[PDB]
Write a protein that binds this ligand. Structure first.
Ligand SMILES: O=C(O)[C@@H](CO)O[C@H]1O[C@H](CO)[C@@H](O)[C@H](O)[C@@H]1O
Ligand SMILES: O=C(O)[C@@H](CO)O[C@H]1O[C@H](CO)[C@@H](O)[C@H](O)[C@@H]1O
Ligand SMILES: O=C(O)[C@@H](CO)O[C@H]1O[C@H](CO)[C@@H](O)[C@H](O)[C@@H]1O
Ligand SMILES: O=C(O)[C@@H](CO)O[C@H]1O[C@H](CO)[C@@H](O)[C@H](O)[C@@H]1O
Lengths: 445, 445, 445, 445
């Protein structure tokens, strides 16, 4: 009618209603239909959104994810719900159950990883639990007792197996591992992926999201699915991926997230008297990946570049990933001021046509910008949340507040959209996306 | 810790989280374990609590309840969840499936009724829907098209079959039909219930609520269960209940609720162009039961009395039911002022030991008062909500606001208790009670 | 930036900041410059806005107004601030200090009256005081002791001297007494006001509001000032005014306000044990003016008409005054439904081009509608407040809530404008208008 | 009644009402009667509280303070209101108008200084102005143009004249300069202050605060006033004070504030293109005083010590000043963790008897603790605000949020007390204290 927005209490109520509605029992789907399984970094954001509602159930969410952790420490990016269809590529296509010696016996999972935001969710659970009294603190502390080792194995696998040369950057073998498979970041690396005899398949994602402008193309999916074939042919063996994979990139945004997560997990380890050797290793990785991120940065603007390991070239694109060094710190004073100027100026948050003062996934002034197309332009509430939380942690209280305020204004339609059109504010992707509700729940306090 | 209360957004979020958690699919249980089925007047309050979250799902809740309506128009007070145990008396004990010719074929139900608050829930659904735009208005209007006749049959059954002498008061054959089975209101009528050979049974309610001070006694349950035997022996036939039932009371609070509900449903009928004959009948019943309520009232204080049909005597007790005339109107000016003075004074809301300025189910100064014992004293959030809504509808904006404010203060522990100790505020009865969350959700706006 | 609206806490703070800034010490100006004096019904609304801030200062505001009461009971519509210029007509033009035998010795005032909303402010003060404990209740009760007699003499002067024929409607001798001097309501009465030798004058209002479209015309001010000459010629004598005034109208909106105010003051009198004869007179007047308002109404639509006493003619116009019967009650059921349909429909709150669901001062479809011009069309926050408060007192809780919600949305720019353009929401008239801040303060709670 | 607390909107409104009520025109008194003049660091906090209400008036507050700046750059701690009495020592006792060659011609002031929080207020003004559009940004930028040089001269006077030896700590000649004249911090320095012939005087502070337990003793005031005699004897000459003053201490809390203020002002200078040499000096001083603060700290616990320059002795006490290093940064990792453990533990925020999780001015377990006595124990809302703002700037978002939440809980009585009893929450000192209202206004947002 005259304004279809919701009040803060109405919005918080609807966000919690959604998150419980996507709960299958011990895992929350990332969306009702498009993503009807557990996703790894979504599950961390879901736990953040559950923490104000039930510390016990937030802990269950991470327990379920960690129960699917591979024998070598990798957290796979999908934990499939038993008997659930409607998502492709599904467990039959990954075939990790029959081909991956490290895959868990009692869960079906994908064969690739996703960004290590999980320590941040643990910190939010602990902060909520400490406000709730003894029995709730005991729940969160029992979770640490039970899962500290698994969290360490996850970070160690990243540091040792995806940074084999100790360059302080994480190597990815699939664009899906960045969280942003169709980002302009990866276009030139995908151009060097030439599928062989790719087994026939039918997409499911664009049956649910039928507007073709909102999802990747068939040609992109052919390359996404071919990379799976290459992993399967070597049975997902870490030692063989560098020799066979047609896509090998160092992801500077994933790397900065890992730097932050190591520092966060290290602080948790000190607070809860975890083994000193573990805390020492976490701080070492935090510093190594901070330095690895800074090494990539533009000498004028501070913007961070990804790296194509096969082509041996810096990937220079105009996306939100450029702001990786803002997450983890480490830039010299003058270059971080330049990077913040880029963030706030007309190429990103200050673009004059934006409905909200938020960070588009791709700069609206880039030739690669597509305002509807998944990670090629739309504004993602999950990125707003991650940037706002990391900015508050840098001490940039007012910058963080402004992102939270605009994110709540954007979410006040109650669509809990996966992403939003940057100019019109139209909800895009899946509606009722779990991590969009989780951002709103964490923000509203 | 220093204050374990929740903010308004945290509380609204937790209330919605609870209501979705008690949703079995198309019905919401009244509580997780103590009441693991659909109850009739609880379902109306659940629909009120769902309306800010999903008009579609609020409508589903009433559709499910009305699908269990008996062939003669009676809405039974329990609609059992298929395959669910843990509540006594359960479907086997009622035996309406085999003995009640009017019971629905496709639902298991109890054999008695409960207060007709359902029109009030329809009004709240309609008010929410009108703020939400065309598609949501169409959902609520389709519900009226589908269920107006059933709602009329429900009111007609009450008016014709439970007020056979057109006295403007509803006759009950079980204390459970009042919603308040152990109220001091009914003690002298129960004293005239003498069980014959009562089939052996085991309670379930005091397995879940083990503190004996919070639930009725075994002796009370023996009388509750014997009344079932009397109904079963005549196969729940309306025409035979007056000849056989050992408990027959005119419930003045139920009667006042019915007066209000008739007026509310009549206004809905006018607004949505329902049949004129129906609207005329609803207004006639609204006036008849208003007059029936006023006829019972104390000539000094305005307090309303129940009536024992078998003993032919006015039941004079000191409970919240005395305030029935405040709900429906009709008292002369001077006597309603006296009744409000009683409400606000030291026998009820103004009692000096109360933690919150709320209406205890029994006056703390009555010899019958028990601060823990179900309907014999505790403060019930559902009654706070009903009184506050009816008071706002009388035009008593500040009185209604004060009840809402104290009700939210009391509920801010997030226990969503079934009822609360009036002096200490201790949560009692079931935790996570659906209609307590619904009151909070409606209030918070 | 992207959103120049204030949060509820920011807006409440700015509203209180404004009200204290317009405080001269013991009186609050109606605006900083346009209305740099105390106005009568503005002072009632200011007291309502002060009640949540300081019951003591709210009481002072009404004490200051009543200290200016005329010896016959009239509350004049302007109490001039000593030594303050910049408003015309000012004290020298009214000349009540030399001509009006009933004017107070110690205050400079105008010589006409304004609507009796004062009892409503007393109710709000009492309601706040009762939530704030004994010392604050004592302040408000002491005000009742000190000023009950003055309030009675105000209501009695209205009932006996402006309703000489006991028709239950208030006669006015100036459009300014209606609050709405350029309302289309008065156009045909003004058309029979033929000025004689009118002494020269210079307007001050359109020096401060320079946009000519927002204020009445010079021709209209000539008639406003000529009526002052007619009053002055008979020394403002109540007994002579009917013989000489060229403007004599029965104001149905003023009459409905008076009915409400009498009923409100009667209930205060009952609650605080004021003399029985006063309470009885107040209820008698409430009923008399309720009936007088109903007598004006169209038998189909319920719309209330004003009456031109000199022409002996019903004044049929399409302004917010038509809704007078909604404030005081009394209409038959069918007629009130019809009037509510007019209010909510496309001629008023339902007009498709309105920015906010609010009541414009003149219907946008009326030929007399002017969207910028004072009382000929703009939306007035003070009317929104008065309608919402009276609607809640009728029991129309949702209708009242919707007006409050839209009024807060409109006021969220922080301009505290006198009135707003109905289609664009542009702030018009004076900024920093005291009764717009008071409405916001009362609403926000 | 049952709950005398105010809602967030009511509290924000009352806080703004108070601040406007203490406004004399161009200066805001620190309290209505106890402190009926402008105080220096109070005026910074008042400007912070005014920024959400009127950027223009917030700027006026700092313009008025800086118009009283001494010719050598010192901002004096009191700017007296013309013709206002009731505070002692007043202008005649200081005699700066006749004795101090650097005192301003057009203002009566004291002859000592106070902590340099002023840059923090400038930052908050700028942050508000940037959310309010171009005309308001122009007001704040014009203030920078007009007053940047004065702010530089204030910081330069501190750095060059109160840190003559470039030790990175500020020397004080009076306990009043610390803000906390009766803090246990100064007891051993005061013990070596031996008054000579002290001219007779009559205290005013304990006429307004009559409870002797809330204010310093007569013996303490004799020493405070004797230090004024020593300053007066040398005409307040910066060059002579070290030779004559019986009280000379390095204040580590003042020093940490100065470090923060320099860094804040440097970032403002970079953002608004102020002279490079100024920005460079500001960063140099920020680093120098950060290091000077760290040099004072216990190597185990991180607790910061003050220094008695005359005794050449570290002053080891248990007050909130120990936490100075948390404001400015610089501690080694292990030492800062230890200091945070002290802050959160049973000697401060964790003490089991505190009503609120807040920082008392003296540790409750210290032998010097007095729960009512000014800076010897009470909880000061202004310190809560300063710690919370600095903590958020460190990146400690949850720690800052908890202080704000508890500070708002404590302030929800609406007394706006100067300080509060740490165990009972009783309001103490002056009511209606301006910087307590300003803290609430900044927090509520
Ligand atoms: O498009 C897909 O099929 C999945 C595959 O992982 O990715 C999207 O969907 C996932 C589930 O929300 C997210 O984790 C990703 O970041 C991404 O937005
Ligand atoms: O005690 C019980 O077993 C049930 C039987 O109907 O009654 C309570 O529980 C029901 C479910 O909440 C309520 O509808 C009733 O009013 C009452 O409080
Ligand atoms: O235009 C004027 O000069 C005055 C004359 O009384 O009226 C307006 O201004 C007055 C003060 O705000 C209001 O009381 C009136 O209702 C009206 O809007
Ligand atoms: O006690 C006094 O007379 C004054 C002297 O400056 O100090 C208090 O009062 C001043 C004004 O509130 C504060 O600035 C101080 O920090 C302190 O609390």
């Amino acid at each position: 009618p005259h304004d279809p927005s919701f009040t803060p209490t109405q919005l918080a109520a609807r966000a919690a209603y959604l998150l419980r509605g996507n709960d299958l029992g011990t895992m929350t789907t990332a969306a009702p239909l498009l993503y009807p399984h557990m996703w790894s970094w979504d599950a961390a954001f879901v736990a953040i959104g559950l923490a104000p509602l039930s510390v016990e159930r937030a802990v269950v969410e991470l327990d379920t994810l960690l129960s699917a952790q591979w024998r070598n420490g990798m957290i796979p990016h999908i934990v499939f719900a038993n008997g659930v269809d409607g998502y492709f590529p599904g467990p039959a296509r990954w075939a990790t159950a029959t081909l991956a010696d490290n895959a868990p016996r009692n869960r079906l999972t994908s064969g690739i990883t996703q960004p290590p935001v999980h320590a941040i969710a643990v910190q939010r659970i602990l902060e909520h639990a400490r406000t709730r009294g003894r029995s709730t603190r005991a729940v969160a502390e029992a979770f640490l007792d039970r899962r500290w080792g698994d969290l360490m194995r996850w970070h160690r696998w990243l540091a040792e197996c995806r940074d084999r040369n100790e360059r302080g950057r994480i190597t990815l073998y699939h664009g899906w591992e960045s969280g942003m498979a169709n980002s302009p970041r990866w276009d030139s690396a995908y151009a060097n992926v030439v599928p062989g005899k790719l087994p026939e398949y039918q997409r499911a994602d664009n049956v649910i999201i039928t507007d073709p402008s909102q999802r990747p193309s068939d040609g992109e999916y052919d390359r996404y699915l071919w990379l799976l074939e290459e992993m399967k042919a070597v049975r997902y063996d870490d030692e063989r991926l560098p020799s066979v994979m047609s896509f090998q990139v160092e992801d500077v945004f994933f790397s900065a997230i890992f730097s932050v997560a190591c520092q966060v997990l290290a602080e948790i380890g000190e607070d809860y008297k975890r083994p000193h050797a573990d805390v020492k290793d976490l701080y070492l990785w935090a510093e190594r990946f901070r330095a690895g991120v800074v090494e990539t940065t533009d000498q004028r603007t501070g913007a961070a570049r990804d790296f194509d390991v096969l082509a041996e070239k810096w990937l220079v694109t105009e996306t939100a990933a450029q702001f990786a060094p803002l997450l983890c710190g480490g830039l010299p004073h003058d270059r971080e001021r330049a990077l913040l100027k880029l963030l706030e100026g007309p190429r990103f948050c200050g673009h004059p046509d934006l409905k909200y003062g938020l960070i588009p996934s791709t700069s609206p002034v880039s030739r690669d910008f597509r305002p509807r197309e998944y990670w090629r332009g739309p504004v993602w509430p999950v990125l707003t949340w991650l940037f706002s939380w990391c900015f508050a942690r840098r001490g940039w209280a007012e910058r963080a507040r402004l992102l939270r305020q605009e994110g709540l204004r954007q979410a006040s339609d109650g669509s809990f959209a996966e992403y939003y059109e940057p100019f019109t504010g139209e909800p895009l992707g899946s509606m009722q996306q779990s991590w969009t509700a989780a951002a709103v729940l964490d923000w509203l306090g």
